[PDB]
Structure 1
Amino acid sequence: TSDLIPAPPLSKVPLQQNFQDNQFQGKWYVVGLAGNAILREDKDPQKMYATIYELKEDKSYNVTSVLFRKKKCDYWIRTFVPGSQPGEFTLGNIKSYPGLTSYLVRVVSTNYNQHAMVFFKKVSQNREYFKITLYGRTKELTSELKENFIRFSKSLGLPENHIVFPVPIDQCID
């Protein structure tokens, strides 16, 4: 049993015009995170983590997320393969994730050198999940950018308790 806010139609999710794959590379901090399986937890608030994008020769990204958990740095590695238009991706080797039948990434907006918003949708054990990340090249972003992220998240049907701003840390992600 679970109950989820439905994924929005893709028509409600903009795509960054003229996406530049080379400029999107490098480290991004997760300054904001929202989704139908994301919940604000005041007892142990979510810690900031980072995601590093590297273009391979074949123009897919190697994507590495690094998180501080149980006193250690944990690394999650995957491959984003260019999809139907620039700024969209599917997940490489999807078969090695049990139960995962669908995975889509769309870069919603970015100026490359400070901030981005990225939309993700997956189907896992037949359940449809989605999330939006607010990425920063630094660990803080302006109020304006955070409010825009909240506005965008709500437009996709998410209430405030499904929107979190992970707390900056120094372990692992420096």
Structure 2
Amino acid sequence: MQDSTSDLIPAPPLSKVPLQQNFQDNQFQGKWYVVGLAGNAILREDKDPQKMYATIYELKEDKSYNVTSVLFRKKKCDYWIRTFVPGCQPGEFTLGNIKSYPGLTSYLVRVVSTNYNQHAMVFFKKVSQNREYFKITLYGRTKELTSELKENFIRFSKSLGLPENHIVFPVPIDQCIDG
């Protein structure tokens, strides 16, 4: 080292960090296909790639979401649920009961921009008693998306988020409706 190196990129603006308008819970609740995964505390290893899964957002008549994440087995798909609830208004939600929770310190969720006919992007941020990690995902609320969406998800995140940490889309297809 000790020579010209790669520190060219300037401070990345929020341009990769927009937020959904006043979209409503009562119609937003649905089932997306997990299509990319990036965060500072996320483990993307070439040796051990992450299989993609699915998650369904189901609102309840009490400004709250019960979210079902679907996973793949060798020939079965199973369900597990986490809850999400809007903070004070639409656009901001939290997970669990971090106010009442012991080792959960601060869980805030804010989807960036959805395109429910193609794709949507999530900004997930949370802390445990003393751990700080955040994750951003892109998934497909439709049966199919675009083949450009692969390069486009990398190039958009790359231009704004460069290769800072574990920010990639190690998510193949393998939709569980085909199994």
TM bucket (normalised to shorter chain) is: 0.7 to 0.9
How much has 1:2 moved relative to structure 2?
24
Distance 1:31 1:160, change over 3 A: farther
Query: TM-score scaled to structure 2, two decimals?
Result: 0.74
Range with greater deviation from structure 2 (21-30 or 91-100): 91-100
How much has 1:119 moved relative to structure 2?
0.4
Q: Is the 8 A contact 2:32 2:141 kept in 1?
A: yes
Q: Is the 8 A contact 1:65 1:77 kept in 2?
A: yes
How much has 1:123 moved relative to structure 2?
0.6
Alignment-derived partner of residue 112 in structure 1? 116
Q: Does 1:59 align with 2:60?
A: no
Range with greater deviation from structure 2 (52-61 or 153-162): 153-162
Per-residue CA shift, 1:4-37, capped at 9, x if unaligned? 9999998973211232323321110110111112
For 2:70 and 2:142, the matched residues in 1 are separated by 15
List alignment gaps of at least 5 residues for structure 2.
Answer: none
For 1:38 and 1:164, the matched residues in 2 are separated by 10
How many percent identity over aligned positions?
Answer: 99
Query: TM-score scaled to structure 1, two decimals?
Result: 0.76
Q: Does 1:94 align with 2:98?
A: yes
How much has 1:143 moved relative to structure 2?
4.7
Per-residue CA shift, 1:71-115, capped at 9, x if unaligned? 765543121111133121012333786521100110100122321
Range with greater deviation from structure 2 (87-96 or 105-114): 87-96
Distance 1:68 1:153, change over 3 A: same
Distance 1:151 1:19, change over 3 A: farther
For 1:94 and 1:134, the matched residues in 2 are separated by 25
Q: Which has the higher contact order (CA 8 A, sep 6+)?
A: 1
Distance 1:3 1:162, change over 3 A: farther
For 1:21 and 1:67, the matched residues in 2 are separated by 24
For 1:45 and 1:55, the matched residues in 2 are separated by 31
List alignment gaps of at least 5 residues for structure 1.
Answer: none
Q: Is the 8 A contact 2:83 2:95 kept in 1?
A: yes
How much has 1:51 moved relative to structure 2?
0.4
Distance 1:69 1:101, change over 3 A: farther
CA RMSD of aligned residues (A): 4.8
Per-residue CA shift, 1:48-88, capped at 9, x if unaligned? 10000111111311101122368765543121111133121
Query: How many residues are treated as equivalent by the alignment?
Result: 174
